[PDB]
Amino acid sequence: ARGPKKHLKRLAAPHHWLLDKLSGCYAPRPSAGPHKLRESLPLIVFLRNRLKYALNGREVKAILMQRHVKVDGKVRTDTTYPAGFMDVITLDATNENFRLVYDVKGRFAVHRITDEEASYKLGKVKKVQLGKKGVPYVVTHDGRTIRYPDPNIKVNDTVKIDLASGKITDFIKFDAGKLVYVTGGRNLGRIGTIVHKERHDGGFDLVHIKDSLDNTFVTRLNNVFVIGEQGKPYISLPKGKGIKLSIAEERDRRRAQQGL
Amino acid sequence: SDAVTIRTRKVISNPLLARKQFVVDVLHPNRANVSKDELREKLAEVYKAEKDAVSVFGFRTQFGGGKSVGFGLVYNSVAEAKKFEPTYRLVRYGLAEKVEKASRQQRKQKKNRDKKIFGTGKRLAKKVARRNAD
Amino acid sequence: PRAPRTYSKTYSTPKRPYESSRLDAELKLAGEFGLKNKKEIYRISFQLSKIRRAARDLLTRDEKDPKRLFEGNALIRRLVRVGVLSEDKKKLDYVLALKVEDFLERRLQTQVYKLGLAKSVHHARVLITQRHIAVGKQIVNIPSFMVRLDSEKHIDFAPTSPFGGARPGRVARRNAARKAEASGE
RNA sequence: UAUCUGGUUGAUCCUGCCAGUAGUCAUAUGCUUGUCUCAAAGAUUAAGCCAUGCAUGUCUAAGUAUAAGCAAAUACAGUGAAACUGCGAAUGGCUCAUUAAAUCAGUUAUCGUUUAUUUGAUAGUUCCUCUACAUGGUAUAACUGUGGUAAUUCUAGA
RNA sequence: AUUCAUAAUAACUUUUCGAAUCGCAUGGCCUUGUGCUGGCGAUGGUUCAUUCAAAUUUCUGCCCUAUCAACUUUCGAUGGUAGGAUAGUGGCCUACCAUGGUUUCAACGGGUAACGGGGAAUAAGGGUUCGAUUCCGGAGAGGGAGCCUGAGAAACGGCUACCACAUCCAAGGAAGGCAGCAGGCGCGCAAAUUACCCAAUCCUAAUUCAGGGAGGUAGUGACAAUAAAUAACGAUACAGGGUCUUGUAAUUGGAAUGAGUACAAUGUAAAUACCUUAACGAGGAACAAUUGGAGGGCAAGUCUGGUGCCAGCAGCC
Incomplete structure (x- = not known):
């Protein structure tokens, strides 16, 4: 139109x-x-x-x-x-x-x-590339671009931009044993550890994630956001620490709330 | 009637605007209604507020009388009360003045008539005076 | 270009309109509880039909289904909170076995007659409409208030309404006015 | 949540269709009309024809001020018509005529490309074997004054 | 996954870009020159990424019709090569050359009172019917074509031409496009005010400030939908069931209350209305409820009266 x-x-x-x-x-x-x-x-x-x-x-x-x-x-x-x-x-x-x-x-x-802790911010590096004039640059999910990163920052990974001038501090790898946020689809907002990643050439490498309470699930790799070592996330997790209670025990704890 | 009572609930401090926001409810078991300016003076003597610096805007009486619930907010330092506030409410509390303007049709007609004049029209006015002179 | 406020209808006309047993039972209910027309019986029948449909397709679901657990527990807890089922009948075969009188017994006019205070259900309804009952503290003038099981101990007269005192009504006011004006002097 | 009843029918049994019953966020129309919340509304025939009015303009400390505009630092400094410059006017809103793998829905693709704007990075190299860089030049509007046309958001020349 | 990203060489170009812009601050250095340097911002600027998008695009899915069985290719139909054109792929076009492409698994043609979907009605199921219409997508501004500007338009509250309408006159020339908001005529079985305002939701702009018939608010409004006033109680006398309970009565009594009227205050952009409330407001022809029906379906007459005819009895009943 x-x-x-x-x-x-x-x-x-x-x-x-x-x-x-x-x-x-x-x-x-x-x-x-x-x-x-x-x-x-x-x-x-x-x-x-x-x-x-x-x-x-x-x-x-x-x-x-x-x-x-x-x-x-x-x-x-x-x-x-x-x-x-x-x-x-x-x-x-x-x-x-x-x-x-x-x-x-x-x-x-x-x-x-x-x-x-309000002076830094994680960012899923989404594509790393040899830029103009032969410099290397990463660009993450929030649109930030950073020039001259360490060569070990690879695709689908996490860097840690602080706020001051960019200048990426210590960064994270991407494998099993790492804490993971999910930001898309049915399993949104759920925090767990990667157990397995099956790579389908042609698209959409699904990820197998096991939560804190042994409820395994799978997402696409677009929704995965690695946030650090299992048990040691570099940010403060929100209230409840991302468990995805079922509705029955949601009822249980909500009437447990009622009464003083 | 003996008394009304004014209770402030859900009080939120908003230093972004230098004000405090709250839900007033008044129990008036007998009288009829709120008498809103008495509530302004009462909220003035509640904190310390100089009642021309307050504004209560939302009010509705519960079914069956007695209880009336509304939203009201207090600014400190009545200069900011004149600053961060819509003009209609400040006219409503007498701390401003309503301007008079022609209604929307007259304003629209005047704008769409002087859309047909290029420049000040001083040449047009002088020319039309000369050309209807002879 | 603004959204619709959704709406529906709570009543439902019956399939065979003209059946002497149905007309007789409807009029029996209307006399026994004091209703205005047949829309009240229809409305309770619609509510009961919805509840029984929910119960049927919950029971066709298997035992110990989590959806069955959650929705059945909510439904049973709701229908005992309103006080239609008893305290010790918290099972679905009983809520299949509900009657319309078990719902009309829990209204406002039925309670404000059964608790005394009215001596007649028709007098109970017209005393509701004239704004004379506070439930808790709130004046109510809907006869179909469907009072909960817990708030049964708070039905009384309002702060207004000279049965609750506070400056008797206009007719008695004029009566005492002409007693003061003519009989007084 | 799962009931049907009359016509054919002279005494019976069925084929069978008609009628009756009920719902419509489905239109119209008749009679009547007190209360509270809620509120669709020139679609259907005519994507037929339109009187008049209005619906698109926009300014900050931060582009241009000599308004012989309003006020109150000898370049200017406050406010601020007109006009230049920049942007927007390609969004809305309305209607359903066209359209039968066309649109559209789900699902992919761009290693087949365009994108003002927003966000993030980004530019020691310029004429140069005699030169403004403590800064090159032209216009033109608005304006002043001269005019035509019955008329137009017409414009002519200085 | 690449002739990718990027780098290098040889050059080339009506040589693109590489700040002659603006506000607010008065810092620092001494050779004390009004010399050197310096902040916080604004606006531009080439490329890459990002975001908002755009345009093409794979698979699969539509209503009726065989009284539509062959269709497409003269004049691109399907394919190859090469060029042109485009933001770009591509028969998109052109030159040349191949003879292919679709189909009884319904091609092609015809019809639609067809915009498509989310959805709506319909409660045993599956289904049958609808979807112009609040959200998503497309198309169009009386019919067609063309085009300037711009990042983005084949734009019509932009332009040009033709066609059909049509306006204004000094008769020479000029100006149009309500399928935006009102509203008018016509057409019909069928559809409302030429109202108030940007206060809300948001949008545009140099931008807290202006503007917005977008939108909101009121008016008409029985489209539809929710809740439920038009009476309640007592006493007397009889009828009963029978010493306590129902009915009747030109018997009677006092209570209650809003429909309305209305100070006021809430409400609102300002108002109206709702919520609250001072005062007034019920004794029946009041403040009076209607719309359909009564052989069965299908619920309710072994009613009443009147009019007209009888070559029937009586005789004027």
């Missing part, structure tokens, strides 16, 4: 924004940036529908354009700048730091963190 699209209606927004189907007939439409809009989270949704700071759209406009909310150590003024996975959004006037990590059930969570 004659060009690009600028509007995103309600009923067409990503389901994991938990947008109310009434009270408005349009969705924020995350403008272009580091992440795809189907797997991002705009600033307005985060600041309006999660922490309940703003109440309207102009309210969060006036919060942002006073130069407050920094994404990845850089001041953002756009209402729909698409903050995505493993992003380290920080608020100055409250001295609070955040890290977008997916909840167990599937949508985004609000993970409070200390001032320390």
